[PDB]
Amino acid sequence: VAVMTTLCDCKDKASKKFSRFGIQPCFICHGDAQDPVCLPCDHVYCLRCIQTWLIPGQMMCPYCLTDLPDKFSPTVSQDHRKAIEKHAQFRHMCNSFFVDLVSTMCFKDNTPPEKSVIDTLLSLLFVQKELLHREHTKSLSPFDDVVDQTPVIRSVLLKLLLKYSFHEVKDYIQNYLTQLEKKAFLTEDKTELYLLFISCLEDSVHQKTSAGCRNLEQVLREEGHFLRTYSPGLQGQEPVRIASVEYLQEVARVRLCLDLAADFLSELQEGSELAEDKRRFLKHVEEFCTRVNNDWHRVYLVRKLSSQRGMEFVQSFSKQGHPCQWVFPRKVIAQQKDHVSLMDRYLVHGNEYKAVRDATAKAVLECKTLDIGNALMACRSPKPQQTAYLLLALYTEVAALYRSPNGSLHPEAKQLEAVNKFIKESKILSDPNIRCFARSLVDNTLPLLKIRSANSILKGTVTEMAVHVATILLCGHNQILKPLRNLAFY
DSSP assignment, residue 39?
-
Q: Which stretch binds Zn ion (CB under 5 A): 23-31, 159-167, 324-332, 354-362?
A: 23-31
DSSP string, 184-225: T-SSS-HHHHHHHHHHHHHHHHHHHHHHS---HHHHHHHHHH
For Zn ion, give the closer residue by CB, 34 or 123.
34
CB of 67 to Zn ion, least distance (A): 20
CB of 231 to Zn ion, least distance (A): 55
User: How remote is the C-alpha of 388 from its chain's centroid?
Assistant: 32
CB of 84 to Zn ion, least distance (A): 12
For Zn ion, give the closer residue by CB, 46 or 446.
46
- Would you put residue 393 in left (φ > 0), alpha (ψ -120 to 50) or beta? alpha
CB of 7 to Zn ion, least distance (A): 25
Q: Which of residues 70-109 bind Zn ion (CB under 5 A)?
A: none
- CA separation for the pair 341, 325 (Å, rounded): 20
- CA separation for the pair 315, 294 (Å, rounded): 23
Find the angle CA(120)-CA(124)-CA(127) to the nearest 5 degrees. Answer: 150
Encoded amino acid at 36, one letter: P
Total interface residues for Zn ion by CB under 5 A: 5
Q: Which stretch binds Zn ion (CB under 5 A): 21-29, 216-224, 263-271, 394-402?
A: 21-29
Burial class (CB in 10 A: 0-12, 13-18, 19+), 379: middle
For Zn ion, give the closer residue by CB, 15 or 360.
15
Q: Which stretch binds Zn ion (CB under 5 A): 28-36, 57-65, 141-149, 332-340?
A: 28-36
For Zn ion, give the closer residue by CB, 28 or 102.
28
Roughly what angle, to the nearest 10 degrees, separates helices 278-291 and 216-228?
20
CB of 83 to Zn ion, least distance (A): 16
213 is in an annotated binding site: no
251: three-class secondary structure by DSSP: helix
CB of 461 to Zn ion, least distance (A): 56
CB of 31 to Zn ion, least distance (A): 6
43 is in an annotated binding site: yes
Encoded amino acid at 3, one letter: V
For Zn ion, give the closer residue by CB, 36 or 224.
36
- CA separation for the pair 257, 251 (Å, rounded): 10
- CA separation for the pair 388, 308 (Å, rounded): 30
CB of 163 to Zn ion, least distance (A): 37
284 is in an annotated binding site: no
- CA separation for the pair 430, 427 (Å, rounded): 5
Please name which of 133, 124, 32, 20 lies closest in space to residue 79, comparing C-alpha atoms.
Answer: 20
356: three-class secondary structure by DSSP: helix
Q: Which of residues 298-327 bind Zn ion (CB under 5 A)?
A: none
Q: Which stretch binds Zn ion (CB under 5 A): 19-27, 88-96, 295-303, 315-323?
A: 19-27
Query: Could you give the string, one character per residue 44-63, with x where binding to Zn ion holds by CB under 5 A and - elsewhere?
Result: --x--x--------------
Contact 411, 424 (CB under 8 A): no
Q: Maximum Cα–Cα distance for the chain, whole Å?
A: 94
CB of 127 to Zn ion, least distance (A): 14
Q: Which stretch binds Zn ion (CB under 5 A): 42-50, 108-116, 166-174, 177-185?
A: 42-50
41 is in an annotated binding site: yes
Q: Which of residues 137-166 bind Zn ion (CB under 5 A)?
A: none
CB of 52 to Zn ion, least distance (A): 9
- CA separation for the pair 157, 288 (Å, rounded): 34
Q: How many other CB atoms sit within 10 Å of the CB of residue 402?
A: 15
For Zn ion, give the closer residue by CB, 34 or 453.
34
289 is in an annotated binding site: no
Q: Is residue 26 a contact point for Zn ion (CB under 5 A)?
A: yes
For Zn ion, give the closer residue by CB, 2 or 65.
65
For Zn ion, give the closer residue by CB, 50 or 376.
50
Please name which of 172, 101, 178 lies closest in space to residue 140, comparing C-alpha atoms.
Answer: 101
Please name which of 139, 132, 63 lies closest in space to residue 94, comparing C-alpha atoms.
Answer: 139
For Zn ion, give the closer residue by CB, 104 or 150.
150
Q: Which stretch binds Zn ion (CB under 5 A): 22-30, 58-66, 246-254, 449-457?
A: 22-30
- Would you put residue 351 in left (φ > 0), alpha (ψ -120 to 50) or beta? left
Q: What are phi and psi of 436, to 5 degrees?
A: -70, -35
61 is in an annotated binding site: yes
Find the angle CA(429)-CA(431)-CA(434) to the nearest 5 degrees. Answer: 65
For Zn ion, give the closer residue by CB, 35 or 222.
35
Instruction: Report the residue closest to Zn ion, judged by CB.
Output: 26
Mark the binding-site residues, compressed into ranges: 26, 29, 41, 43, 46, 49, 61, 64
Binding site residues, Zn ion, CB under 5 A:
26, 28-29, 46, 49
Mark the binding-site residues for Zn(2+), compressed into ranges: 26, 29, 41, 43, 46, 49, 61, 64
